Amino acid sequence: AAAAAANLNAVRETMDVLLEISRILNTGLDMETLSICVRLCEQGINPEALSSVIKELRKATEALK
Amino acid sequence: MIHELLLALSGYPGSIFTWNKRSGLQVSQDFPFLHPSETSVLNRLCRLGTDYIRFTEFIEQYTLHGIYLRAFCTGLDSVLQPYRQALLDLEQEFLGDPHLSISHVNYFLDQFQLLFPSVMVVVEQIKSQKIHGCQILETVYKHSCGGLPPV
Amino acid sequence: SRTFLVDPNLDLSIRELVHRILPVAASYSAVTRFIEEKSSFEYGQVNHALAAAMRTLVKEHLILVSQLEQLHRQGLLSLQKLWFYIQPAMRTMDILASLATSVDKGECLGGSTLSLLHDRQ
Amino acid sequence: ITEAALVRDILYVFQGIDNIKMNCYKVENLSRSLRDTAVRLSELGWLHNKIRRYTDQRSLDRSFGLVGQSFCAALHQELREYYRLLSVLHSQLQSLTLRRLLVWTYDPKIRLKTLAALVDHCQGRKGGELASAVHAYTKTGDPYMRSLVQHILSLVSHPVLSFLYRVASDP
Amino acid sequence: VLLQNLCCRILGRSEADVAQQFQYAVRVIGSNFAPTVERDEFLVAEKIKKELIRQRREADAALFSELHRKLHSQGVLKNKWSILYLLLSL
């Protein structure tokens, strides 16, 4: 109806602002990957643990390239 | 009240922002809805509106005659263009988030507040000394060697 | 050298622990007065940069008090829990409150303020 | 009087506009733990007046020279930024408290300490004699001040190096 | 199942292909699930401003303050500390 379309707008905003904080900080993330890391952080997950993973899978994708 | 102010800074006075032929734009008196401390910053903000009104009134009046006076006013609107354009923007920012106060609106003018004052006496010297003819191309030039980069 | 007063009518099971937290405040009221004074030019180009680098830690000590009040709103901050949180601050603000009292005891400026930082986690 | 109400007035005393009224900003009830922190915070706004009066009293008379303008027009680029900070602080008032302000405004308690004491050391100096009295503030050593004043000197000494690349004259 | 989508986004592969990495991701995430530090969005905010100021980008440090309020304005996010703690680390 309406309250189901007002929520899809307030999420496209926040997902557009977090993409600005992401580029001025020069994280290699992009709009597709960043939506995965946000969902995870909503359920409650150690960002000291989740960031060690991303700092590793990006560190192994080079040995294969 | 925001859109009320952004018109008062455009050249349209109303009940909240009365107009006086001698002093200039100013707030009428204390208002219960707003705080009693803002009654100052607005008066500091109107010191800018008075300039634009006294500008555009002179621009329209064309007053003295001569092409060099016609062209001066013709150019005087060009320097005054970024003022208007920067005022249209304020409404857009307030249309987005409804948490912006007068503080941010006062902050946005910034450059116009330190420009109009120095470009106010240049007009006053003309209307007070009957500067007729090409002599304007010096009276404006003698003030072109000012220190203020914006001016 | 600051002295404090607590309460005539308070639980003894608190006052003995209050006096265990204050030595980070008294050791702080002598650092912030060392900054606002040894910044005067008539003290050399060393007693200045010593007071500047001694200010960044004061900034990080003000953040550690902010994060406690925001954690105090949820009530998760018991008095016993406080005595453990400030321990990194009770050791640092105990070092600086000893240099700021040993640089002003014997008036030092210039090299003699760079020697004391070489004899003194 | 709620703590939030104090946070509302303080964000104005940082500018000059006055519970907190106008040399210390004497506040006039509330608990002693609140009045003390307001006093120091309110006083920072008072400094902003001393630096504003100079860039307004001398922006009036036209007999201050060409150097006295590049100085009075370089005390404004170091004030728009102080107007950007007040912008950010106001958007969060809709959370921040007194003890949270102290860390926010601990640095602009110094820049508003050098500038408010740089306009008193050079009061009656016009022309090059002013570009020589804002250079006697560089022999300081403090890496935060010597890298601020050594920028205002790079603007004030631009008109002087404009005559030179083109000394009292006699009409 | 959601951890396996991540290993397919970062590494471009299918879940039948990449299974050594996903074996390493269950090792780290698992046994480290519970949050270890007290959660507050205030402290994490004053560290993303302190970081964008340190890069001479003082204009984006005051834009974040306007984007962090909108997150509270809408109210579809339960744990705002976590997602910021992570965006700051990357």
UniProtKB/Swiss-Prot annotation, chain A:
Disulphides: none
Key words, A-Z: Acetylation, Cytoplasm, Cytoskeleton
Signal peptide feature range: none
GO cellular component: centrosome; cytosol; gamma-tubulin ring complex; interphase microtubule organizing center; spindle
Keyword Cytoplasm belongs to the record: yes
Main location: cytoplasm
Location in or out of the cell: Cytoplasm, Cytoskeleton, Microtubule organizing center, Centrosome; Cytoplasm, Cytoskeleton, Spindle
BP term (GO), one: mitotic spindle assembly
Family, per entry: Belongs to the MOZART1 family.
Subunit field text: Associates with the gamma-tubulin ring complex (gTuRC) consisting of TUBGCP2, TUBGCP3, TUBGCP4, TUBGCP5 and TUBGCP6 and gamma-tubulin TUBG1 or TUBG2; within the complex, interacts with TUBGCP3 and TUBGCP6 to form a luminal bridge with actin that stabilizes the initial structure during complex assembly. Interacts with TUBG1.
Function: Required for the recruitment and the assembly of the gamma-tubulin ring complex (gTuRC) at the centrosome. The gTuRC regulates the minus-end nucleation of alpha-beta tubulin heterodimers that grow into microtubule protafilaments, a critical step in centrosome duplication and spindle formation.
Protein name, per record: Mitotic-spindle organizing protein 1
Species: Homo sapiens
Residues shown, of full length: 11 to 75 of 82
Swiss-Prot record, chain B:
Protein name, entry field: Gamma-tubulin complex component 4
Tissue-level expression: Ubiquitously expressed.
Family, per entry: Belongs to the TUBGCP family.
Oligomer and partners: Component of the gamma-tubulin ring complex (gTuRC) consisting of TUBGCP2, TUBGCP3, TUBGCP4, TUBGCP5 and TUBGCP6 and gamma-tubulin TUBG1 or TUBG2. TUBGCP2, TUBGCP3, TUBGCP4, TUBGCP5 and TUBGCP6 assemble in a 5:5:2:1:1 stoichiometry; each is associated with a gamma-tubulin, thereby arranging 14 gamma-tubulins in a helical manner. Gamma-tubulin at the first position is blocked by TUBGCP3 at the last position, allowing 13 protafilaments to grow into a microtubule.
Location(s), subcellular: Cytoplasm, Cytoskeleton, Microtubule organizing center, Centrosome
BP GO terms, sorted: cytoplasmic microtubule organization; meiotic cell cycle; microtubule nucleation; mitotic cell cycle; protein-containing complex assembly; spindle assembly
Record-level Gene Ontology MF annotations: gamma-tubulin binding; structural constituent of cytoskeleton
Organism: Homo sapiens
From Swiss-Prot, chain C:
Functional note: Component of the gamma-tubulin ring complex (gTuRC) which mediates microtubule nucleation. The gTuRC regulates the minus-end nucleation of alpha-beta tubulin heterodimers that grow into microtubule protafilaments, a critical step in centrosome duplication and spindle formation. Plays a role in neuronal migration.
Family: Belongs to the TUBGCP family.
Disease implication from the record: Cortical dysplasia, complex, with other brain malformations 15: An autosomal recessive disorder characterized by global developmental delay, variably impaired intellectual development, speech delay, facial dysmorphism, microcephaly, and varying degrees of cortical malformations including pachygyria, thin corpus callosum and subcortical band heterotopia. Most patients have generalized seizures.
Localization of this protein: Cytoplasm, Cytoskeleton, Microtubule organizing center, Centrosome
Name assigned to this protein: Gamma-tubulin complex component 2
Tissues expressing this chain: Ubiquitously expressed.
Variant or mutagenesis effect after changing R55C: In CDCBM15; uncertain significance
Portion of the full-length sequence here: 243 to 371 of 902
Curated annotation (Swiss-Prot), chain D:
Location within or outside the cell: Cytoplasm, Cytoskeleton, Microtubule organizing center, Centrosome
Domain of life: Eukaryota
Tissue-level expression: Ubiquitously expressed.
Subunit field text: Component of the gamma-tubulin ring complex (gTuRC) consisting of TUBGCP2, TUBGCP3, TUBGCP4, TUBGCP5 and TUBGCP6 and gamma-tubulin TUBG1 or TUBG2. TUBGCP2, TUBGCP3, TUBGCP4, TUBGCP5 and TUBGCP6 assemble in a 5:5:2:1:1 stoichiometry; each is associated with a gamma-tubulin, thereby arranging 14 gamma-tubulins in a helical manner. Gamma-tubulin at the first position is blocked by TUBGCP3 at the last position, allowing 13 protafilaments to grow into a microtubule.
UniProt record similarity statement: Belongs to the TUBGCP family.
Task performed by this protein: Component of the gamma-tubulin ring complex (gTuRC) which mediates microtubule nucleation. The gTuRC regulates the minus-end nucleation of alpha-beta tubulin heterodimers that grow into microtubule protafilaments, a critical step in centrosome duplication and spindle formation.
Identification of the protein by name: Gamma-tubulin complex component 3
Record organism: Homo sapiens (Human)
Gene expressing this chain: TUBGCP3
Coverage span on the entire protein: 245 to 452 of 907
